[PDB]
Amino acid sequence: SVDREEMIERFANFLREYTDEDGNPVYRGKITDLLTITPKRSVAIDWMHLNSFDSELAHEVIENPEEGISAAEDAIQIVLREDFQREDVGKIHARFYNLPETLMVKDIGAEHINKLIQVEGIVTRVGEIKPFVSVAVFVCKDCGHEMIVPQKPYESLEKVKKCEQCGSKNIELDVNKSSFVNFQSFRIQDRPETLKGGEMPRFIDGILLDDIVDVALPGDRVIVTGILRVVLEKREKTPIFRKILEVNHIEPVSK
Amino acid sequence: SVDREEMIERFANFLREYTDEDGNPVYRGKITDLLTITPKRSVAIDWMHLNSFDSELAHEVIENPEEGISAAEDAIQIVLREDFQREDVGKIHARFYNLPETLMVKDIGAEHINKLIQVEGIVTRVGEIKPFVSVAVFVCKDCGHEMIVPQKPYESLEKVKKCEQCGSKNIELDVNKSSFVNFQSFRIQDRPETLKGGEMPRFIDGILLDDIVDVALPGDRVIVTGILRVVLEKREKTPIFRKILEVNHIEPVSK
Amino acid sequence: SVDREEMIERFANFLREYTDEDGNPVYRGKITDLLTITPKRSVAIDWMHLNSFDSELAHEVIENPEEGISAAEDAIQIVLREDFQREDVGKIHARFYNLPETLMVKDIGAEHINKLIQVEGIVTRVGEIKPFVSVAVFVCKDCGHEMIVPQKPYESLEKVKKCEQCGSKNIELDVNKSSFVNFQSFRIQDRPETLKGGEMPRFIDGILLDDIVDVALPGDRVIVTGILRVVLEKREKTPIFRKILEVNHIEPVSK
Amino acid sequence: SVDREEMIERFANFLREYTDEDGNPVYRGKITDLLTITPKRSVAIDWMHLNSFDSELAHEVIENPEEGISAAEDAIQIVLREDFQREDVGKIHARFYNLPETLMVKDIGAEHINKLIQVEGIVTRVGEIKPFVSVAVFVCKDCGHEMIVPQKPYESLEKVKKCEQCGSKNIELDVNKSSFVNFQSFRIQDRPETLKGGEMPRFIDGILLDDIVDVALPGDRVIVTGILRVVLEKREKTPIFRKILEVNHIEPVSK
Amino acid sequence: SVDREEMIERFANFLREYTDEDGNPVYRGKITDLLTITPKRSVAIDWMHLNSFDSELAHEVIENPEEGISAAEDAIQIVLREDFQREDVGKIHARFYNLPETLMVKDIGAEHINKLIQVEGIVTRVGEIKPFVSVAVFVCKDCGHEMIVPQKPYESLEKVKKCEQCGSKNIELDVNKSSFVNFQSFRIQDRPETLKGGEMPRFIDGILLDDIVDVALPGDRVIVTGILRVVLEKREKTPIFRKILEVNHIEPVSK
Amino acid sequence: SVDREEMIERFANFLREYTDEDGNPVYRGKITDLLTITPKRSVAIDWMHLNSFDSELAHEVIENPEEGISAAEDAIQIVLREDFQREDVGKIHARFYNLPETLMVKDIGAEHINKLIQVEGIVTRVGEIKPFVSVAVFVCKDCGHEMIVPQKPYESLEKVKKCEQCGSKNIELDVNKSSFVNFQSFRIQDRPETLKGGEMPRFIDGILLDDIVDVALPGDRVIVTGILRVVLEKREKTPIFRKILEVNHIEPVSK
Ligand SMILES: [Zn+2]
Ligand SMILES: [Zn+2]
Ligand SMILES: [Zn+2]
Ligand SMILES: [Zn+2]
Ligand SMILES: [Zn+2]
Ligand SMILES: [Zn+2]
């Protein structure tokens, strides 16, 4: 594998040095679009650009999308600070698109768990848009100590009943110090055009966070990139799992 | 930010010194209307008046509506005592209206949590009117000690199983010493006129207390000001939240 | 307020000394009607009579109906013993009627909790008639000690898991030593004649005990007097309350 | 009241000495009918006979039907042993009929709890016939000790988690040593002939044990004697009760 | 009663010595039919044969069917070993038929609990055929000790949370060492021919094990012999019971 | 029985030495087909081939399919390493087909528990395809120790609340180190052609793992081989069991 520390360096270097056919550093341009009047909160990164620049790294985001995306996001922060003199910008997402192989909902299985995959499909359902705690801060009601606990949208809420410093059992979730972002579920199934003869469309539930929330409604067909995540079924006692697609990138397709 | 102590002083000074086009101190007049035969229990404050008089403070009520409204209410109490020789008047509400930006139900999201927002919409549902304990007094059944515990209409009831003085586990809610006000839920969604082409109306549940209860019924379109509050969903184990609008001001709009 | 001890003295003196236009002590007469063949178990008291005789006390029953009615009932017991030579008569109810202001079901709110109110309305529902334990006696299955615990018809049953004398956890409810009276729920809402133009009738659930049970059925319009009581909603975790009218006096009205 | 010990003596003396118009000791005859080929398991006792012979005792069965019926049943056992030389006969029921006042289902209330009452009515429902443990024997799975615990058909099952001798928590219900009798529920309501003008028939659930099980079906109108018993409603937390009629005697009436 | 030890001796002697009209020992013949190519797993025993040979014992199987059937089955095992030189044969059932009195479903009651009864009726329902653990073997996951716990098809599963030897709480049900047989429920009610004039057919649920499973379907009228067993109703807190017929012998009847 | 150690040796020798009519070692060929471009993850083994080569072993897979299949799979791994110089190949399934006796769904019973059986039938239902943890790895959140716990698709998930090394109660399921395969339920019942005259089709639920998942849909008639497994019914307190067929081999049949 590729070191975390090192992976960032190669991502920084990719952003600032990759050029298209005419020599324009495209990622410089994109990183610039984070600074305008009505800015963007994320950088869409074309996998093919990355693969042509550093294919070893390109493969490591599909194999380890977690440390990969995190590395890229740190890198974006670096070039902002070093090259644009901007430190006080928020979380900026790294959103990879246009992956080598694009598979169908029916093709998704155990061999994808924790790996970035591209999926074509059609949106069947969309949730209402609720707040998610991306980072919860628990404050000790007694000694006043603060504890930072990042959360995961597909997992359950990780509380902490005991104070890490004084050890009192009087703790609460501090909504002001905590970090919320918009959250939205959606369902996506295989497109009935690519199927049948008497076949059954399979589906997959997925989640959308922050800036990519609300991009789609029922009927829209889409290409989405994401991580395939598993979580045990309701009862929490069967060795069988429920699969959710933590979306990293969406875009419509003109039918 | 602005100090609590200081924030009150600026609010007092705003109430007694702000004048309209002709020089009538309007808030003096309003504070006066608390003392008539069939009095009012609140002072509607026009944000624009405030902004023109002290814009730093005006912005601090939208950013910190909790300490802001509380400050204003204390100030009302001060001018009553100092300028009208009235101390025995009850809780008088500070109700801010006419905010700079007025957003739609569909626009409400994580970025509004704990911030005063203005919302235009249409009332879909209204609850029946129940008593709420705005302040509960728990009395020790054993040593007879009294404990004051203010409540929040959107949160759950905060009991106290242990006596703060003698430490006995025999305590009850004393309905006479406790403070009740009327409570009423309502639902408000985006107005179908400002939507569609095939779009879905989003909604938000909201709460009404004391003097503003029962001001509206299903069908009425309204402009409401309030705080966007979050509370975890039923199960209390998912890091996803339910959003409620603790209303600070309502008024109809003649359709 | 008025002392409990003293309040009784003034009620005794009201019963035996108040006379109508011709000088007949009406309450002497009423107290007498408790002693006939098919006696009554309560004395209806006309508020106006009381107000004209002792208005300070008359106001204290509307403000403190609990200690007020209780005081009056003790007084009845006194005149029975002192003036009729009767000690072995049961609980005799004090039932106040004809109060100064008579409000509607829609007018009932937080500002009435624990205060005697008069309400006009129409009966929508009536419960089946069940036994209520007005006074429960718990007996220790071990040391045989007896403990008296008066109950409230709108509250839940107050048990006692521990023996007050020997401290054994083997206790039961002794049905023979305990005191039961008939109990009956009913619903009353605003009369559709005093409403609408497109308005919604509000309702209130209420309870009837002992001699006043079974006085009314669905369709009958009535004027009832009673105490407005609150109790938390099902879950027992929301600071919102359910309101029940513990009836102190009912009478039909010929429509 | 009348002593238990003594009450038996007067019952024995009633059975063997009471004579009708011609001098036949009727209860001797009845007690004799317990000994034939297809015997009876109970003695029907005509209240009027008893009242004319010993009215003090006759009133004590209506006031204390529990110790009264029990006394009578012990007495039957005495005359069997002393006068018929029969000891090995089973439980023989004392079943009182023809009481002074016969009231209607709608008349039944809190003033009857634990008192023998006569009721006329019509059977609406009958249960299927299940076994009831009239006496449960619990055996210690460890030290083999036996404990006798009589049960009540309207109450719940009284277990015993702890051994009275060795104190082990390994105990079970021994079906062989335990005593079972047939049990059958039924519903009886006021007869529609004795009602209306727009009136609602009230009902009461009742239970039948052993030899009187299966005596009636839906449609049959009956006069039943029995004890009015109370037991708390489902939740077991409201001071309101459910009333059941533990039947002591039934007989049809030719409509 | 009759001793267990002794009871077996008389059963052995019955099997090998009872002869019909011509002197053929019929039970020798039957015991022989356990040894053929497609053998039987039970010996039907005609009660009348037994009664004529040893009526004291014949009555003890109707009074104590549990120790009686068990005794007979041990005896079959004895003659197999002693007279046929066969030890490795499985559990062979003793299935009694043709009892003196044959009663109807509606006649079955508390006076039959734990006694072999014959019943005529018609099959209304039959369960699907599931495996039952006739003998469960629990193995200690820690010290590897094995514990044998015979089960009852009408009772619940008797686990054992603690190891009888080392006392560890890590135990599981070992499916390989445990003994399973086929199980099948059925319902049988009184035949509508032997009823009515406006009468209601009563029913009884029953169970079938091992070789007698699947012998009947809905519509078939049958004569079954079995034990009447009781078990408490769902809640497990009312002293009322549910009755099930543990079938010991079935046979069709040509309608 | 046959030793585990030894059983493998005989299986290795069967794979590499068994030849058909022309002398081609068929299993060499099959093991070869695991190595191509789009390889297979299992070796279908024809029972008849095995029976003709080593019938003692052939019978031991039907009697002990668990240790049998496991032995065969180890053997496949041996020939791969020793004869193909391949060690890094995954789990490869041993899938036995064409057994001596092929029985019907209605014929399946307690006498098959834990034995490989062949079943003909028709597919009625098929589950959606979920991930199953074939091997769970639990990691200690405290001392970082790893524990391997193989799971069973028909059983429940076997957690481990205590750390095997440090003994901390802070443990979680590590999805990355854990092993997942696709899982799919299906229902199969007797074919209506081989039945009736007024007969009822019986059914059996079954499970498919890994490479054999998704091979069939409702309507397809099939011959499947598998293990008959039992597991207690929902409540987990009745000695009755639910039967599931852990499929070891499927194939369609052209109707
Ligand atoms: Zn702390
Ligand atoms: Zn205290
Ligand atoms: Zn005690
Ligand atoms: Zn014991
Ligand atoms: Zn052990
Ligand atoms: Zn550890």
Author numbering:
A (entry chain A), B (entry chain F), C (entry chain E), D (entry chain D), E (entry chain C), F (entry chain B): 0 to 254
The publication says:
Hexameric MCM rings act as the replicative DNA helicase, encircling the leading strand DNA template at the replication fork. Each Mcm subunit contains three domains. The N-terminal domain (MCMN) possesses an OB (oligonucleotide/oligosaccharide binding)-fold and usually a zinc-binding motif. The MCM complexes of several archaeal organisms consist of six identical subunits and have provided powerful models to investigate the atomic details of MCM structure.
Like SsoMCMN, PfMCMN elutes as a monomer by size-exclusion chromatography (data not shown) but adopts a hexameric arrangement in the crystal structure. The RMSD of the C-subdomain Cα-positions from the sixfold permutation is 3.03 Å and 1.45 Å for hexamers 1 and 2, respectively. In contrast, PfMCMN without DNA bound is highly symmetric and shows minimal RMSD from sixfold symmetry, indicating that DNA induces asymmetry in the MCM ring.
